[PDB]
Amino acid sequence: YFQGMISNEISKLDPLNLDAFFNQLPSLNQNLEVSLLIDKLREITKSYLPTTFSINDALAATRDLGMIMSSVRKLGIQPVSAVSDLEVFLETLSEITNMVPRETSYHYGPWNPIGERERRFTHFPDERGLIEGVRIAIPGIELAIREINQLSNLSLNDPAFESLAKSAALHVYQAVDGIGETIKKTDPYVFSHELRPFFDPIRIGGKSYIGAGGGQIPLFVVDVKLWLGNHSPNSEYVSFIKDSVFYLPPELRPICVDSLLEPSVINQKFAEFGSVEITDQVIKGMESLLSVIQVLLKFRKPHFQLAQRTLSKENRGNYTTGSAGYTNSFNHMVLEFTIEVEKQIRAVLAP
Ligand code: HEM
Ligand SMILES: N[C@@H](Cc1c[nH]c2ccccc12)C(=O)O
């Protein structure tokens, strides 16, 4: 009962009439023009009644208001503390979106218009590497989620299982396309120095909300359904996912929650494999699961490398963490998790 967060219906809206302002935002930020930032926040709280907004209006308004707030926070000022009327404006908006009162990578990517209206913090072309990265990744991962969700109720011997899993790996490849756009467009040093500071936490109604981040693409939702399940309860990754659930669009929360409380597909299919008549289609089915896992590795291995060149002493600037407060050890932990799964499947397929 959440369906219908359609990206092009949100990307096209300018509910707070900020299109002109966003063409100036990169120069406002370059020149440290905090006063114009505060003015615009003040103007917004007096110019609009957010209770009047449709759901799509509020999503797009969160995107735009969030990025102005992020630009204030960049300089070191908590924007809700400086503009106290924001707090009820952000309360009203999140009642409608049933999402956090802050922009996430959904707002920064798929819900961010292509072309002249594209919302950007800076004039640096490196910023386009992040935006295109998540704009490409997210719709593909979402498609993969719905496909992997259907694997639980299909038999390994059913060729519909193999086809579904193959569609999922192809959809996940969009995350691979996306990090490749980043690697080719975003210099690590420019990231740490020019872009990362727009992704810091903001205090809203007595709680801190992290900035938008690539880690907010719903890839962890693929992981929990596909291989993590309820199998590593006190793990660091489970704690990250736990902290991420209510950042997700509402439509994805049930899938994530159910999956954290259930055996994973691969654990379920490892049992069916070594307990039923192993046929040629059954091997294809099992091989389609290793295909998905191997596509996840084609994202995580170059991601780890880019994060390592960025967080090196040479390039890291004032930061040792991503927006969610972790170092590259966390990326190493997810990649080693995924490598272990690939190892296990290969071992089950060895004869
Ligand atoms: C210079 C660019 C980038 C750097 C330095 C970087 C670094 C990091 C770091 C340090 C984390 C740990 C979590 C955190 O602290 O927030 C993380 C998480 C993550 N980021 Fe990035 N990242 C970059 C670009 C991207 C892009 C463009 C995407 C998506 C298209 C992405 C996808 C992810 C994912 C999925 C995770 C969760 C871990 C996983 O699923 O393997 N990253 N990243
Ligand atoms: N993926 C990293 C770096 C990052 C920060 N903001 C982003 C926006 C888009 C893509 C990646 C990022 C993170 O989640 O912290």
Residue numbers in the entry: -3 to 347
Give the exact sentences the study uses for this entry:
Pyrrolnitrin, a potent antifungal compound originally discovered in Pseudomonas strains, is biosynthesized through a secondary metabolic pathway involving four key enzymes. While heme enzymes are known for their abilities to catalyze redox reactions, the reaction catalyzed by PrnB is unique and complex, involving C-N bond cleavage, C-N bond formation, C-H bond activation, and decarboxylation. Naismith et al., established that PrnB belongs to the indoleamine 2,3-dioxygenase (IDO) and tryptophan 2,3-dioxygenase (TDO) superfamily due to its high structural similarity.
The crystal structure revealed two protein molecules in the asymmetric unit, while gel filtration indicated that the protein behaves as a monomer in solution, a finding supported by PDBePISA analysis. In all cases, the indole rings of the ligands are oriented perpendicularly to the heme, but the positioning of the amino acid groups varies. First, a previously disordered loop in PfPrnB (residues 323–331) becomes ordered in FbPrnB structures (residues 312–323), where it plays a role in stabilizing the substrate carboxylate group through Ser319. This loop closes over the substrate-binding site in the presence of ligands, likely aiding the enzyme in positioning the substrate correctly for efficient catalysis. Another major difference lies in the binding poses of Trp. The difference is primarily attributed to the substitution of Val117 in PfPrnB with Tyr104 in FbPrnB, which reduces the size of the active site pocket and restricts the indole positioning in FbPrnB.
